[PDB]
């Protein structure tokens, strides 16, 4: 570790810890910048040389974390929990968490190499017949093909190409990750991840939220399954079984918005899928980011700095570079450089993703003056919710009209049902998936799910919560969890379930603050500087304060709450229940063992 980056001696008291934290911040920014920059260079240009550079930067970060973490314990272990400065307690708490820096050198290198190789495999995997990438090629097939056999080829091809080679690496990663965090005092890595929510009843709290939400998902599921049965027929759709996992418009069946045309009940109302209008009008990726930015500035939040426009990767490169296309938002920890890396496609759902990413950036801009250790969301679910809250306002027909994407605005109950159904395909359908991904990983980290049951337990959970089934037989040579970005890229997922609940609590509070009085689903907080001020107070707080207190200041409650989401969707919840009763549906999938047959001439 460079001499200028090493911790000196400080007095073993709170005054000394303040100075220690200031000195840490100065050097941490340098070490994080080099690590984030090396990761950027690789993720926008996947090469062996750039991977090498990123692994060397990660090794330096581990040296830094070990030196400062050990110094924090040497000086403050018996006293930091009693410091009067609550933010300093949180800073010291973070610095003394070494994570992978607990590993000896050789295992650090193995750990860093595994992360690099799992990332490369996921983002360079192809499906060949001439080869298709996940983004845009297979994504577009899953979204717009209605050939059962073509969807199956893409779904099976992708899961095989990404998942199979990842399994041996993921086993090794898990063991090293657990070894690292056991030395920070956690039973396993999942316990460390769950500890971020600082709730002794986290898992019970989540389960009670899901019990309130599940009836909405069950009714959406049955209605969509019936719509698919009318198109694909009784051979490929079992009205009492799980839905084949490749038929819902998305590789992971996690968002069902692409099958809106098959379920829309009132099709002579305005067409809420504005993708075709975006294309007709000549929208490009940069337009989508400028439109998102101007929503933020309408709230008197910050515009994107020049460094963002000059440095970001907002489209897939056409120069032959391999890149990580999965959308992400980057803080370089120098208070200057902030970037999005997204292979943006011109579609309505990508407009939502753009807003999601710019919500991340906006958080970074607002808390950039805090100490580096507090530059994060009040909890990770907060960070995932910011952009989604704005996207809820952007998606309303009145707002789409204002930005020229919808010529006619109607305000009637049929239009309400269309709108809420489309939003439910996006928000309700996701809930079981957002919940189940980390249940899978928590079991892997705890040892409940050994490598010999990776796929067995994945599909147990996929069927249990989502009510889907694989369209071809799978076995433990397959590693289908690994075919989802966040698993090989070691990004926790429960934050997205928390986000999908939280964003409706935020929306309700900001709509009230904006003076809006009508139905929650027609609120648009555009140009509400009062709502902007309330959101800004959250963003500027970072992790300086307990999330429960930040939430209470914002929405009036110190806990996650499903009631705002339930209230948003109430009209379509009742409508779907009525439709399913009238149609004689079975809610759920009691024929849980059912899988569809293979097409006759497959893959031929
Ligand atoms: C879409 O339309 C709904 C319903 O509009 C109502 O019913 C129609 C058939 C017409 O008769 C309308 O004239 C009538 O308002 C709108 O929802 C309604 O919004 C108004 C405010 O714009 C709400 O009134 C307020 O209520 C609060 C608390 O009660 C008072 O403090 C205010 O002073 C004000 O009176 C009204 O409650 C609300 N109704 C429902 C059922 O939500 C909706 O705003 C509209 N959408 C858009 C985008 O304009
Ligand atoms: O794709 C998913 O599964 C989820 C749900 C989706 C969301 C889009 C808007 C509407 C609701 C669904 C967004 N997302 C993401 O992973 C996008 P991120 O930036 O969090 C992914 C961040 C990955 C970790 C990272 C962070 C910084 C730099 C490099 C890597
Ligand atoms: C992608 O990364 C590679 C390195 O992995 C870059 O190639 C280097 O480019 C510099 C300047 O052009 C040369 O001096 C080096 O000799 C190159 N190294 C190798 C290994 O080829 C490449 O420029 C990057 N591409 C983009 C578009 O940024
Ligand atoms: C695992 O699965 C591989 C792929 O074939 C699958 O299983 C066979 C039995 C058929 O049902 C086919 O439709 C499926 O896609 C096999 O190549 C492999 O042998 C299977 N077994 C193991 C241990 O890997
Ligand atoms: Ca779409
Ligand atoms: Cl999380
Ligand atoms: Na989608
Ligand atoms: Zn995100």
Numbering used by the authors: 1 to 129, 135 to 609
Quote the study's own text:
Human angiotensin I‐converting enzyme (ACE) has two isoforms, somatic ACE (sACE) and testis ACE (tACE). The functions of sACE are widespread, with its involvement in blood pressure regulation most extensively studied. sACE is composed of an N‐domain (nACE) and a C‐domain (cACE), both catalytically active but have significant structural differences, resulting in different substrate specificities. Even though ACE inhibitors are used clinically, they need much improvement because of serious side effects seen in patients (~ 25–30%) with long‐term treatment due to nonselective inhibition of nACE and cACE. Investigation into the distinguishing structural features of each domain is therefore of vital importance for the development of domain‐specific inhibitors with minimal side effects.
